[PDB]
PDB file of N, CA, C and O in Angstrom:
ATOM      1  N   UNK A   1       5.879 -10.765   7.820  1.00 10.21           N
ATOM      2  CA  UNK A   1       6.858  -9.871   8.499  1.00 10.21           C
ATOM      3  C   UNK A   1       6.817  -8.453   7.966  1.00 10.21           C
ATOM      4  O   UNK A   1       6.665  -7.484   8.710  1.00 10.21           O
ATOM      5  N   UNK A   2       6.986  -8.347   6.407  1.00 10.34           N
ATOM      6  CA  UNK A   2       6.636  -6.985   5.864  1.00 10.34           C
ATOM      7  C   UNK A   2       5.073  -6.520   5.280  1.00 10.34           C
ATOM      8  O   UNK A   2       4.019  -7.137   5.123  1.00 10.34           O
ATOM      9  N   UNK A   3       5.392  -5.472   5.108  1.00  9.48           N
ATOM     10  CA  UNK A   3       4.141  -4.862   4.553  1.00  9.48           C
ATOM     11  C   UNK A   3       3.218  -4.624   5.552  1.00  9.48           C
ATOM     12  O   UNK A   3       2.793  -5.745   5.831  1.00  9.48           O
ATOM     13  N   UNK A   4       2.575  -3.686   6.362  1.00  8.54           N
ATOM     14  CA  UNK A   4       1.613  -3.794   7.235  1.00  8.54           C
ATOM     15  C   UNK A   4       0.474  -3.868   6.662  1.00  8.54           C
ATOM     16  O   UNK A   4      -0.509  -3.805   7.400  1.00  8.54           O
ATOM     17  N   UNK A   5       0.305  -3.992   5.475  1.00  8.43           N
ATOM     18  CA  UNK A   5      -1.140  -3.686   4.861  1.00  8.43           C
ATOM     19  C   UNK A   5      -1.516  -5.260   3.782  1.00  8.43           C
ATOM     20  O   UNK A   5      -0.833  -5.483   2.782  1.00  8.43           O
ATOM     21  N   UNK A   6      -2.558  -6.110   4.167  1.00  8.24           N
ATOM     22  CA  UNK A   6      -2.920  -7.354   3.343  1.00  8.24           C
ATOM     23  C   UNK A   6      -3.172  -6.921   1.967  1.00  8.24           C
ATOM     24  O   UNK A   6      -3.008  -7.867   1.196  1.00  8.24           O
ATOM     25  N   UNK A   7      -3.503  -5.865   1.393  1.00  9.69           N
ATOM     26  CA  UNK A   7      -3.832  -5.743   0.238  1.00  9.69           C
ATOM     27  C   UNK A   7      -2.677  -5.669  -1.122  1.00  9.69           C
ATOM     28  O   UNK A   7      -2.538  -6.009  -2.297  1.00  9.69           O
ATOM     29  N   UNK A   8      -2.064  -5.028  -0.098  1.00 10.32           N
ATOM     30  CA  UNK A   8      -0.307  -4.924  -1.336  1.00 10.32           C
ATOM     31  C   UNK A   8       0.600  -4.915  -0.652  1.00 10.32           C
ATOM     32  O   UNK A   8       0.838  -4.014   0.152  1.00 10.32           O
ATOM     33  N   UNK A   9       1.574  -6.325  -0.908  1.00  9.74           N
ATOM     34  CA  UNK A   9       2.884  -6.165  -0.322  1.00  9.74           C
ATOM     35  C   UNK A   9       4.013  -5.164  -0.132  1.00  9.74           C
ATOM     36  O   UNK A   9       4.757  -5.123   0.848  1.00  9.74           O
ATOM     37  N   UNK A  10       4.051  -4.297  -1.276  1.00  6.97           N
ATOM     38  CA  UNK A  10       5.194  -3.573  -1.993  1.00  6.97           C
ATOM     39  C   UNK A  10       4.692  -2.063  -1.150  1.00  6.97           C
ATOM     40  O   UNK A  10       5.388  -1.080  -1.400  1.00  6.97           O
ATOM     41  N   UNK A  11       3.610  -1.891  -0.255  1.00  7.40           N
ATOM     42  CA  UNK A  11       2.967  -0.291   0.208  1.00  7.40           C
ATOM     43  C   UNK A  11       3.986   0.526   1.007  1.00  7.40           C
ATOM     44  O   UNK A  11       4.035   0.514   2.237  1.00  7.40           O
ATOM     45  N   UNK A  12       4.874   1.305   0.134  1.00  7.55           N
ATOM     46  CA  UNK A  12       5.542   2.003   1.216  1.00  7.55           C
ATOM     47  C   UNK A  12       5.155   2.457   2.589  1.00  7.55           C
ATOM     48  O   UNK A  12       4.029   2.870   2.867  1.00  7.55           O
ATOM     49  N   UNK A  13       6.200   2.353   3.476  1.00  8.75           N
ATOM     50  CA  UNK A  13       6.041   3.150   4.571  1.00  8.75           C
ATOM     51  C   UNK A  13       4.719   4.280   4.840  1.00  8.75           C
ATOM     52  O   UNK A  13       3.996   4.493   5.813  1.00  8.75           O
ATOM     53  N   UNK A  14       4.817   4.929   3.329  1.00 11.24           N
ATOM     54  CA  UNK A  14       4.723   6.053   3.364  1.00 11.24           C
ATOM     55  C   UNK A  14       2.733   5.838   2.971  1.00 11.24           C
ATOM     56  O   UNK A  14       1.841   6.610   3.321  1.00 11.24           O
ATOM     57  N   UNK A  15       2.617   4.783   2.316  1.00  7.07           N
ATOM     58  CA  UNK A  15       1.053   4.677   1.709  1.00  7.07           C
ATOM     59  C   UNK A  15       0.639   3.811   2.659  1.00  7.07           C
ATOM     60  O   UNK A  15      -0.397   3.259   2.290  1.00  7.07           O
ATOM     61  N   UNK A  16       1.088   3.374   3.967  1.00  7.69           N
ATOM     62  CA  UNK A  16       0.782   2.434   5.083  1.00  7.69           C
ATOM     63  C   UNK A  16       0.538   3.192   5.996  1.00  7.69           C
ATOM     64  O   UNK A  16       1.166   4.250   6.039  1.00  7.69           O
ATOM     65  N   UNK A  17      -0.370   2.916   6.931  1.00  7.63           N
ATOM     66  CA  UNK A  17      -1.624   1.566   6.841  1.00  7.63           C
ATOM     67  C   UNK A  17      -3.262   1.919   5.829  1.00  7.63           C
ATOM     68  O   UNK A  17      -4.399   1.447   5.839  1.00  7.63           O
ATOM     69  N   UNK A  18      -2.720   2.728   5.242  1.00  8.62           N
ATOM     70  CA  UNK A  18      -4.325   3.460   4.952  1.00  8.62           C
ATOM     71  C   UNK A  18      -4.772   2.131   4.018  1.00  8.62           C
ATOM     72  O   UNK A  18      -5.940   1.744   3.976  1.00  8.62           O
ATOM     73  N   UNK A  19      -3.934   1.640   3.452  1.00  6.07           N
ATOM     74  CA  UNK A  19      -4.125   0.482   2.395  1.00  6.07           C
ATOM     75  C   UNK A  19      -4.635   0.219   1.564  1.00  6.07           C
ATOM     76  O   UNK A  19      -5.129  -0.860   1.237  1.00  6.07           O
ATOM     77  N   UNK A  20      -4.591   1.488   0.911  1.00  3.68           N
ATOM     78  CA  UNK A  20      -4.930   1.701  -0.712  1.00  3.68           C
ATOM     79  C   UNK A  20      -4.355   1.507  -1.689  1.00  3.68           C
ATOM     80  O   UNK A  20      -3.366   2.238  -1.737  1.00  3.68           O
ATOM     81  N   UNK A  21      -4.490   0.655  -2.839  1.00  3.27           N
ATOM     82  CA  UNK A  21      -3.656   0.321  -4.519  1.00  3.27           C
ATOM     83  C   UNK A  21      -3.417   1.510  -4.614  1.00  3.27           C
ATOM     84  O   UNK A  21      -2.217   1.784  -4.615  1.00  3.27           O
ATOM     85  N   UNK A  22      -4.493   2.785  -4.741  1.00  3.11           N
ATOM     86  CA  UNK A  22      -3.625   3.971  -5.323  1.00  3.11           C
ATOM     87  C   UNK A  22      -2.329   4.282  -4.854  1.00  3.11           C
ATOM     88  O   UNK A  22      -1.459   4.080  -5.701  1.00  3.11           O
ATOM     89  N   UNK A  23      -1.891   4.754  -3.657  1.00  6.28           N
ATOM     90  CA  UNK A  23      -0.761   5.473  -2.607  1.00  6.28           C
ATOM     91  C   UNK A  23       0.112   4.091  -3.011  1.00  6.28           C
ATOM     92  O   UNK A  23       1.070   4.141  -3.782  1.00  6.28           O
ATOM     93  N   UNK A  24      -0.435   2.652  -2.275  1.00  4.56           N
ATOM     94  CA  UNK A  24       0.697   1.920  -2.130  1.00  4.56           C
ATOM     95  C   UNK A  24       1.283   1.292  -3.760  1.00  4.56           C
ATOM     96  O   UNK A  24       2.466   1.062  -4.008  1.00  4.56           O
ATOM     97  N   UNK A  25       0.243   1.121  -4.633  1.00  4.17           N
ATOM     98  CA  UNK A  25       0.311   1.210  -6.353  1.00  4.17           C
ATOM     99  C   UNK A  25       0.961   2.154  -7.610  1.00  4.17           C
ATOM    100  O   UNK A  25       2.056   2.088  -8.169  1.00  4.17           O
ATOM    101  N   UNK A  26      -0.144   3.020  -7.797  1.00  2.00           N
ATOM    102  CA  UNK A  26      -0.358   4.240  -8.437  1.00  2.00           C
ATOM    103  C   UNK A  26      -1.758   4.986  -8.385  1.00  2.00           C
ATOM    104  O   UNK A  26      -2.816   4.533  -7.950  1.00  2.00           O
ATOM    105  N   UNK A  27      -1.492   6.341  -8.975  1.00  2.00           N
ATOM    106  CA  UNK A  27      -2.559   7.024  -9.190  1.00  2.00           C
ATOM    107  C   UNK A  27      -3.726   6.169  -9.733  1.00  2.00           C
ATOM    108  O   UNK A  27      -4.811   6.694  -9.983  1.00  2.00           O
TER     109      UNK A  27
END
């Protein structure tokens, strides 16, 4: 239901959909 991105649950809004650990993680 959440997260649009398979790689990391927690990817803000804001680091979605590009679906990168960095943005949706850290630097």
């Amino acid at each position: 239901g959440s997260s649009s991105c398979p790689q990391f649950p927690s990817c803000s809004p804001s680091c979605a959909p590009q679906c990168s650990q960095q943005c949706c993680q850290q630097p």
